[PDB]
Amino acid sequence: VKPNYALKFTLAGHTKAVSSVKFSPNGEWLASSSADKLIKIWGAYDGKFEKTISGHKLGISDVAWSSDSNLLVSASDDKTLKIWDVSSGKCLKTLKGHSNYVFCCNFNPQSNLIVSGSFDESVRIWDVKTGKCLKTLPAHSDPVSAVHFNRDGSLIVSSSYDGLCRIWDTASGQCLKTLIDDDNPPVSFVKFSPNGKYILAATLDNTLKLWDYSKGKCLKTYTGHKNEKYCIFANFSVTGGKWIVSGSEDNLVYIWNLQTKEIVQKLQGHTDVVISTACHPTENIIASAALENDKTIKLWKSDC
Template identity: 25%
Template sequence: MAALFPPPPGPRFVLRGTQSAVNTLHFCPPSQAAGNPLLFSGSQNGLVHIWSLQTRRIVTTLNGHGGQGVIWLKTLPQGHQLLSQGRDLRLCLWDLEEGRNTIMDSVQLDSVGFCRGSILVRGQQCWMLAVPGKGSDEVQILEMPSKTSVCTLKPEADARPGMPMCLGLWQVKKTHELTNPGIAEVTIRPDHKILATAGWDHRIRVFHWRTMKPLAVLAFHSAPVYCVAFAADGLLAAGSKDQRISIWSLYPCP
């Protein structure tokens, strides 16, 4: 009997060469890519790779975390600057303008866990940074780039929330309970139409953002998927413990 629905498509292409589990992904904004679409990846071996999506090859490798895993990457709006967070207890600010790859500044962190930081841009020259705090259940908020401490979020005395595993600075919020356990990351497409999750069960799941209706389950990776990221044009990237980065073209942006 023929299937009622066609199976989900396979990846558009696959990037190989990290030689380590892929912990985090981030697309370079079009305004900074100078016509060459770029993807940043952070690996368990402590390296940040910059990929050309035209040639599908690594064009630059950043080594600033002493071999300790890179768990978060984020570009800043003011010029060619990249934040990288590693398990070496450092958050580095890279200058990538005109081919440079130097560390401009860094923040010493207090937590050696796997929790990624988060930023909320407040203007061209300043942003808020949330990172795990000194206590295992605390979150520290800093005003950047001055590194001024805004506050430390602590649970109530009788609460036991445990160690934070994911942070997000938001100006509006919406919640939904997912039925599949073991979600490493959730990301929303820039047009707020769909979202994707990275699953410990080797699957990438795609949902309609407004209704949370399941749209697709993507099965390609042979190990847990640790990260997912959307490009401005809707391209989806997923990184896995299997050392591969899959690139998907689903539900194109209108």
């Protein structure tokens, strides 16, 4: 019926707001990005500080892991992405092409492609093997807030303040679906569900919505949190009960029962906007990250 997530770790290394936290697919590590231009690597079960990765010239808005947990990609206001070797902390390549801030990034399951979204209103698909840009999609008419691959990587979903979610055919670059809703709220985050039949979208009206993007039908709406100003990550939690997890502008982590739409737990502890959350791949552990007045990552643990 409910989870029981409890504070177990606080991770304080960043000297500015933390922008994004991701768990490595193998479950050993957590990566944090920050406005302080650094990536930090943390042990996922012990909270232990591992490594500082540096190189970006401005703040970093996003980071993501390759499937084998050996590579990272980050997205920076310096108009580049960077591919890092996690073991040595070295930058293997700087992906230049975007003409404004790069805001969000992600590997496909195979991890031979990277997708990136930018303030230049384009989605870009990059070759992990060469570093070269493969496709430039004129995806949106306002900043791209999120990019995500589906389970087998044949599809990309993108989101924008233009109010659209777009489903893209990875192979061809064509658009299979544009999703639009009443009063055109800006879409601040989007991601496929783990089975790939649905899409989870946050709008800056304090709302997350589960959509069947094929029929364009909204199946579930989640409210109660606060989301009017920041692009806040949300997640499907699957290791125990089936939850929806999100940060919120009232410094709380919100958890909902996915099917009933009810708030099942609110996590208190941060002292600023919770901009990012992530769900561990095998354990009932949540990572959360907060902004300038907090600067820290928190790890929480639950029996279900």
